[PDB]
Amino acid sequence: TAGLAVELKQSTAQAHEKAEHSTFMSDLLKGRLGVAEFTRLQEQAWLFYTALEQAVDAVRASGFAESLLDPALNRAEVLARDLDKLNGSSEWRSRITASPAVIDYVNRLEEIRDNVDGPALVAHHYVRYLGDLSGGQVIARMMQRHYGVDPEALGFYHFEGIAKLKVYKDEYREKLNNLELSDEQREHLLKEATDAFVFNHQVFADLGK
């Protein structure tokens, strides 16, 4: 009754809370881990953001949700640069492999990409990017504070090209509210958003293992 942004927040609350409270992310943010574990996180993130951004490109090209799917949000190329700094060479590209959790997540993104499934893609976009815009400074700050990570290796969290960030998040939520969705597409979107948090929790679980 209060618009899609509010409903997404409320519908995904249980899954979001489960993901935010994983042991791996909890130890990472409290300073118990190290730049190594942060680097492993960012390597798995590079795999699933590469897949997410293929799916966003296909959806944007179909004409669905275009103003929401701002290409300034793309993280994959920035993440690779970060991983070039963190690993000290481009060695990582040919070494990293998807964890099982990341295989399932990437598979789902690739299904969404090739189905060109606009409402599913919007769900995954909200769960990753709005997250990144919202709590991302807190993650970048803890990485600098606990681990000494250089801010030039935290480009993923900087969002180059956005000046006023609170404004941008506000407009992102209004763009969600303004999306034209059938009841069926809206249900599909809400369910996919919860699945997105579930995938992310399992990514942190596999990292912890």
Positions marked active-site: 21, 49, 127-128, 131-132, 136
Assign 56 to helix, strand or coil: helix
Phi, psi of 80 (to 5 degrees): -60, -45
Binding piece for ligand BLA, criterion CB under 6 A, among 13-21, 84-92, 115-123, 147-155: 13-21
- Judged by CB under 6 A, the chain residues 88 through 127 that form the site for ligand BLA are 126-127
Binding piece for ligand BLA, criterion CB under 6 A, among 15-23, 73-81, 107-115, 176-184: 15-23
Binding residue for ligand BLA (CB under 6 A) from 13, 61, 138, 167? 138
**Which residue in this structure is represented by tokens 């807190």?**
138
CA distance 22 to 54: 27
- How many angstroms separate the Cα of 133 from the Cα of each of 39, 124, 165? 20, 14, 8
| Total number of residues that touch ligand BLA (CB under 6 A) | 16
Question: In the complex, what is the shortest distance from the CB of residue 138 to ligand BLA, in angstroms, rounded to a whole number?
Answer: 4
Binding residue for ligand BLA (CB under 6 A) from 4, 29, 86, 143? 29
Residues in the chain preceding a C-to-N separation beyond 2.5 angstroms (breaks):
none
How many residues would you count in the chain? Answer: 209
Residue 206: how many CB atoms within 10 A of its CB? 16
The verdict on 37 binding ligand BLA (CB under 6 A) reads no
CA distance 88 to 191: 40
The verdict on 130 binding ligand BLA (CB under 6 A) reads yes
Closer CB to ligand BLA, residue 6 or residue 61?
6
Report residue 89 CA to chain centroid gap. 24
Whether the Cβ atoms of residue 3 and residue 186 lie closer than 8 Å to each other: no
The verdict on 135 binding ligand BLA (CB under 6 A) reads yes
Query: Which stretches of the chain bind ligand BLA, using CB under 6 A?
Result: 8-9, 16, 19-20, 25, 29, 126-127, 130-131, 134-135, 138-139, 200
* Annotated binding-site residue numbers for L-ascorbate: 20
